[PDB]
Amino acid sequence: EVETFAFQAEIAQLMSLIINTFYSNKEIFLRELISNSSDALDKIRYETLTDPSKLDSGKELHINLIPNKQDRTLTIVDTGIGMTKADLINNLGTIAKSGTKAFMEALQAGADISMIGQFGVGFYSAYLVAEKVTVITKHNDDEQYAWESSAGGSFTVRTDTGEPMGRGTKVILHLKEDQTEYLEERRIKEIVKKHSQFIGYPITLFVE
Ligand SMILES: CCNC(=O)c1n[nH]c(-c2cc(Cl)c(O)cc2O)c1N1CCNCC1
After folding, report:
1. Which branch of life, at top level?
2. Which of 159, 187, 194, 203 shows a CA-CA span of 20 to 30 A to 65?
């Protein structure tokens, strides 16, 4: 059923640095998420170039944004390659330990946090606005899993006999009391227009 994993020390440190460092420009989280989705869609597209069956689990490659003012979530869905359980345990497909190192040094030499994605650990910026992050993922070569954490040095993984998804990744953000602007139509379109206007895949913003 539910396995529990400790973050490597370095991720745990990045996460804490992200949660505590005073830093106003929290909007970038959306850009790192959308850009992760796009990377993952590149990958299923690439793979399909040589094997068309790769797309049997769905041929539309797209990114939806789904706010929910009632649950206080913002969900980013994509029809990318997805991750296996191994990928979810191994820092969500990232090279997060070396990447946290280069980010740490960079930060001490005058990066700011908005530059997190140049170090390959953009996922973690989700913790700028979310108290808890659940990732659901289905890869063609594995079953559906949900990865979850509220930081604090640990994460969980479990099989998701929830809503089958076909193929993709779904990042539900459970937003902090004071970051509900990220749930407003007006405010999301603005961030997508500003940081994510040249993404090679349709982005749909759902309405409620
Ligand atoms: C090994 C093949 N799978 C993937 O690469 C993958 N599948 N889904 C994602 C993904 C990860 C995050 Cl954090 C996200 O917000 C969206 C994604 O699609 C993936 N990424 C995106 C790039 N960083 C590594 C994990």
Report:
1. Eukaryota
2. 159
Q: Which tokens is 8 given?
A: 């490597």
Q: Quick one: angle between helices 28-48 and 185-195, nearest 10? A: 60
Question: Looking at the domain covering 1-208, what would its CATH class be?
Answer: alpha beta
Paired with 159 in beta bridges are 145
**Nearest ligand 1 atom, CA 37:** 18
Domain boundaries, the chain: 1-208
Tell me phi and psi for residue 83, to 5 degrees.
-120, 155
Q: Is the dihedral of CA 172, 176, 178, 179 positive or negative?
A: negative
Number of H helices and E strands in the chain, helices first, is 5, 8
Please, which residues bridge with residue 145 across strands?
137, 159
In this structure, what token pair is assigned to residue 33? 């998420």
Say whether 123 counts as a known binding-site residue: yes
Q: Where are the alpha helices (DSSP H) in 21-112?
A: 28-48, 85-89, 96-108
Asked if 165 contacts 136 with a C-beta cutoff of 8 angstroms, the reply is yes
> In testing the pocket of ligand 1, which one of 54, 81, 201 has its CB within 8 Å of the most ligand atoms?
81
Cβ–ligand 1 distance for 181 under 6 Å, the answer no
State the amino acid at position 38 in one-letter form: S
The angstrom resolution of this structure is: 2.3
Sign of CA dihedral 91, 202, 139, 155: positive
The amino acid present at 92, given as its one-letter code, is L
